[PDB]
Nucleic acid binder design. Structure first.
Ligand SMILES: [K+]
Ligand SMILES: [K+]
Lengths: 238, 120, 31, 246, 100, 157, 49
RNA sequence: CAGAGUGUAGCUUAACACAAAGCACCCAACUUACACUUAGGAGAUUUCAACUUAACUUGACCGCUCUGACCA
């Protein structure tokens, strides 16, 4: 064996659920792009019918010719009015959920626009520390296979994660604080593997408050300073 | 009556000239050179010069290229250079920058064609 | 971000006017 | 029979194993730029430059001129950047550049050019004209004192002398008006020579004008060592060069 | 309809801002890839020193990675109890056949 | 000249890839993936085209070879809706589905994780990403169906 | 077809320097090229390759 | 927190002064797209003091990179 204890951590990430709000400049560009597109486009079928309908209505007033006008039962603006009514009746889902107002950092539903990372609290040496879920490597297993195992060990979890590749995306090497330093057990070496949370969540008993789903900005409050520096390298916030 | 360097018909650009206007455009600057066929630079105008840069909002736009033409034309007349050839590529010749730079030179007095050699 | 490549216009010479609409899916999500 | 190359052959450093992954020119202008650079480098094979290039001496040209002026680069650069910021901040400047209606003031450009890059441009042009080769046998100097020679033509006009601009013998009938910037108590010597005028001897010149021990810039008060003679280029002999050396 | 001078001026200035805004998106995205790549490579080097066999497995390709399917984000999230209208989907795509 | 040291100074065809007048799919090695098809399907043609353009440019920045960029045939679907207090389905909307493919090759085994993460984060709303391994069936699916060959082939069956 | 005037040979204006079916030798300074790719001297002087 | 190395925007053994350069890079138009071309956009000497010279040399001051302490 070797002095360093091989560990395998899992960086399980919930990708953004909804699109991100446009910034002020993006909104200005979006308006200009919409304006340019309208200017350079041809008349749509709806526009032509509205033009034709108005023209025929003037013809009916100025002249007595009718030409059946069966389609004139409904005008193109009358249709627009009906379309708007149905839209105002439908209520859209809330992009800002109750967990955003309650600040429940245990639920997936919060912060739909941003990416979230899983953090589980583990007790080492009679001390509580926040870390990414990890397991200890065992012979007859690939290093990624150890990360695949971390999910199974989680308390009452029903989640299907998609693992990206076999190589680790980071590493954190620490040494015990002189309490149990020994040549046999010098320290540990965690290797992180990224995954995507396809579907699922923790159960009520698993929602005991020993885990949080946190964005990269609010990731420092939990993770220790040295641990935070190595996790903030492969966790993007694009 | 001086010999021009004829030949080089299969390569570009020609050598059959006494003086040529050569324009160098970079990512940040615009430089125009008048050089003899032997390779000696006679006069030059660059936006790198403080004398020109201090009056330019941008040193890389069409205005800078037109300004360089005007400055170079004056320096050409003071050096005695009244004729030169300009050898642009097809895309360079079509560009608005080079068209404005050429107009500046012709308006400034310089003729961008050279008189034919007298052989007899 | 989703806005990286979402700000666009119809890059055609001849095209009829198009209108922005919300497509409500079967689960209630919109696009 | 083969002979090994006498040096590194062209296109040798290119790795031909990874040809598909190597970056290509993709543009005519990028190849031409590299091609022009390659043409200028020295080569161990026969080249056009070898047979047609002027044979410059390997030893550098001796400088016989005034010492370069001392400038504080840090302060100069700071002031220059501040000026550009002010010019770019103006909204009217940006619109004129965007609408391509802006122009530079040529008079101001020449004044600044004369203070800064003027001397080096005059040296470059003087070298091209052969003045250093003929006057000083190849020794060069930077004309760090701008000299303004103008031939009075009529009563209301002047014919300025620059650096190779044509002036007719009729315009140069009388001595020119010479003005330069000089401090008090300094002394100067002004001469006028015709490099090409000499009739009998090819390498000799004609001393048209010599003024010596000029106090400051008061050319009129200098000693007339040689009186002024108007240029007399012979008919059919070509275009001559006349140089004023301060 | 011809645009007013102020409109054409406003559109030109907005696009000038767009060049710089998009330049800074690319930088943020170009510095993120670099950070990820450095972290991965540094971890792999650390994993070769500790255990070469595991490093050999780590650098192999994953047969199960592809097909990799990901839908883009929605505008609004799914509604917990939303009943869609009843209807049918009738494909009307033209079928093109090559004869001769 | 052959005898002279400058022999071969004008050689240039070793610096250019040989040109040969459908295409064999290169299966990836243990450490590099094979030809990969990046499908981009959206109900809006501009979003699919814009993201396909983003993916092509991103691959160029990363020195990932783009074998081909092409569009798949558009699929039109009529959307009928049961009318209120009626048993008749009436046409509601016609939705078209636009697909764009960016075919890449030579992606590394390690770098695949980083590449996939970047191209999913920038995915616009309503655009589906599907990265598949290229197969002959994918290429053949871009060609018109031949009914005459089917009838002649049926006789052999 | 081939070189008529080798390195160092004196040529007069008009003298055909070389004849070639393809561009084996390219025209340089004071060397014209004919319709059939024929290289001829444009000046009196010394041939140089 | 200590000990070393280290210093122009992304790179460069660009920077004599006449000057902070060349390329890479970003937007738009063209292109299915890419590429090319055109027309635009954004940039740096870590900060002071020493022939005032000095992006360059010596010092501090900052940022950076490793080596230890700290570390679950
Ligand atoms: K003479
Ligand atoms: K021939």
């Amino acid at each position: 064996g070797s002095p360093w204890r091989l560990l395998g951590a899992l960086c399980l990430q919930r990708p953004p659920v909804v699109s991100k709000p446009l910034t002020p400049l993006q909104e200005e560009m979006a308006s200009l792009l919409q304006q340019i597109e309208i200017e350079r486009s041809l008349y749509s079928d709806h526009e032509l019918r509205a033009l034709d309908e108005n023209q025929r209505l003037a013809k009916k007033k100025a002249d007595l010719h009718d030409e059946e006008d069966e389609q004139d039962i409904l005008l193109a603006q009358d249709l627009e009015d009906m379309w708007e009514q149905k839209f105002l009746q439908f209520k859209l889902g809330a992009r800002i959920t109750e967990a955003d107002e309650k600040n429940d950092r245990t639920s997936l539903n919060r912060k739909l626009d941003r990416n979230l990372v899983l953090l589980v609290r583990e007790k080492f040496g009679d001390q509580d520390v926040w870390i990414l879920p990890q397991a200890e490597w065992q012979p007859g297993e690939t290093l990624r296979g150890t990360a695949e195992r971390t999910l199974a060990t989680l308390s009452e979890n029903n989640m299907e994660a998609k693992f990206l590749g076999n190589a680790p995306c980071g590493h954190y090497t620490f040494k015990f604080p002189q309490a149990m330093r020994t040549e046999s057990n010098l320290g540990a070496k965690v290797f992180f593997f990224k995954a995507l949370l396809l579907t699922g969540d923790f159960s009520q008993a698993g929602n005991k408050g020993h885990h949080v789903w946190v964005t990269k900005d609010e990731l420092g409050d939990y993770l220790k300073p040295k641990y935070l520096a190595q996790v903030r390298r492969f966790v993007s916030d694009l | 009556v001086a010999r021009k360097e004829r030949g080089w018909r299969t390569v570009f650009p020609s050598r059959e000239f006494w003086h040529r206007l050569r324009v160098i455009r970079t990512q940040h600057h615009v430089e125009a050179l008048v050089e003899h066929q032997n390779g000696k630079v006679v006069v030059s105008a660059s936006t790198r010069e403080w004398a020109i840069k201090k009056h330019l909002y941008s040193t890389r736009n069409v205005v800078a290229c037109e300004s360089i033409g005007r400055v170079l034309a004056q320096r050409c007349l003071e050096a005695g250079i009244n004729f030169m050839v300009y050898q642009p590529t097809p895309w360079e010749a079509a560009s608005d920058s080079m068209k404005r730079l050429q107009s500046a030179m012709t308006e400034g007095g310089v003729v961008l064609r050279e008189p034919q050699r007298i052989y007899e | 971000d989703s806005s990286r490549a979402s700000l666009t216009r119809v890059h055609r010479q001849a095209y009829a006017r198009l209108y922005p609409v919300l497509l409500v899916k079967q689960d209630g999500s919109t696009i | 029979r083969r002979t090994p190359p006498l040096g590194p052959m062209p296109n040798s450093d290119i790795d031909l194993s990874n040809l598909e992954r190597l970056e290509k020119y993709r543009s005519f202008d990028r190849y031409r730029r590299r091609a022009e650079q390659e043409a200028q480098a020295p080569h161990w094979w026969r080249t056009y430059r070898e047979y047609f290039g002027e044979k410059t001496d390997p030893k550098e040209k001796i400088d016989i001129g005034l010492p370069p002026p001392k400038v504080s680069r840090t302060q100069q650069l700071l002031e220059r950047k501040q000026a550009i910021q002010e010019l770019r901040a103006n909204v009217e400047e940006e619109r004129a550049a965007r609408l391509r209606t802006a122009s530079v003031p040529l008079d101001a450009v020449r004044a600044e050019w004369e203070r800064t890059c003027g001397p080096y441009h005059k040296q470059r042009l003087a070298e091209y004209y052969g003045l250093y080769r003929d006057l000083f046998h190849g020794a060069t100097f930077v004309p760090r004192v701008p000299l303004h020679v103008a031939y009075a033509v009529g009563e209301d006009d002047l014919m300025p002398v620059y650096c190779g601009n044509e002036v007719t013998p009729t315009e140069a009938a009388q001595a020119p008006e010479v003005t330069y910037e000089a401090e008090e108590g300094s002394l100067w010597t002004l001469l006028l020579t015709s490099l090409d005028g000499h009739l009998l001897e090819p390498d000799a010149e004609y001393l048209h004008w010599l003024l010596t021990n000029i106090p400051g810039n008061r050319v009129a008060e200098g000693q007339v060592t040689c009186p002024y003679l108007p240029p007399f280029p012979a008919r059919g002999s070509g275009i001559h060069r006349l140089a004023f050396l301060l | 309809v011809e645009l007013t001078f102020e409109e054409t001026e406003r559109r030109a200035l907005l696009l000038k801002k767009w060049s710089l805004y998009k330049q800074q998106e690319r930088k943020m995205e170009r510095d993120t890839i670099r950070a990820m790549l450095e972290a991965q490579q540094e971890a792999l080097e650390e994993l070769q020193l500790e255990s070469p066999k595991l490093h050999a497995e780590a650098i192999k390709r994953d047969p199960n990675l592809f097909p990799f399917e990901k839908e883009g984000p929605h505008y609004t999230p799914p509604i917990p109890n939303y009943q869609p209208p009843e209807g049918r989907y009738n494909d009307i795509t033209k079928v093109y056949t090559q004869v001769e | 000249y052959k005898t002279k040291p400058t022999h071969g100074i004008g050689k240039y065809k070793h610096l250019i890839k040989a040109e040969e007048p459908v295409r064999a799919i290169n299966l990836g090695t243990d450490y590099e993936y094979g030809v990969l098809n990046i499908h981009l399907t959206a109900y809006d043609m501009t979003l699919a085209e814009s993201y396909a353009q983003y993916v092509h440019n991103l691959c160029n920045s990363l020195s990932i070879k783009v074998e081909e960029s092409y569009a798949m045939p558009t699929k039109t679907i009529e959307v009928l809706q049961l009318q209120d207090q009626g048993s008749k389905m009436l046409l509601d909307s016609v939705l078209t589905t636009h697909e764009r493919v960016v075919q890449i090759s030579g992606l590394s085994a390690t770098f695949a994780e980083i590449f996939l993460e970047i191209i999913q984060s920038s995915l616009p709303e309503g655009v589906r990403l599907s990265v598949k391994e290229h197969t002959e069936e994918d290429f053949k699916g871009r060609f018109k169906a031949r009914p005459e060959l089917e009838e002649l082939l049926a006789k052999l069956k | 077809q081939g070189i008529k005037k080798m390195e160092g040979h004196y040529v007069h204006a008009g003298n055909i320097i070389a004849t070639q079916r393809h561009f084996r030798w390219h025209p340089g300074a004071h060397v014209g090229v004919g319709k059939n790719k024929c290289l001829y001297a444009l000046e009196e002087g010394i041939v140089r390759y």
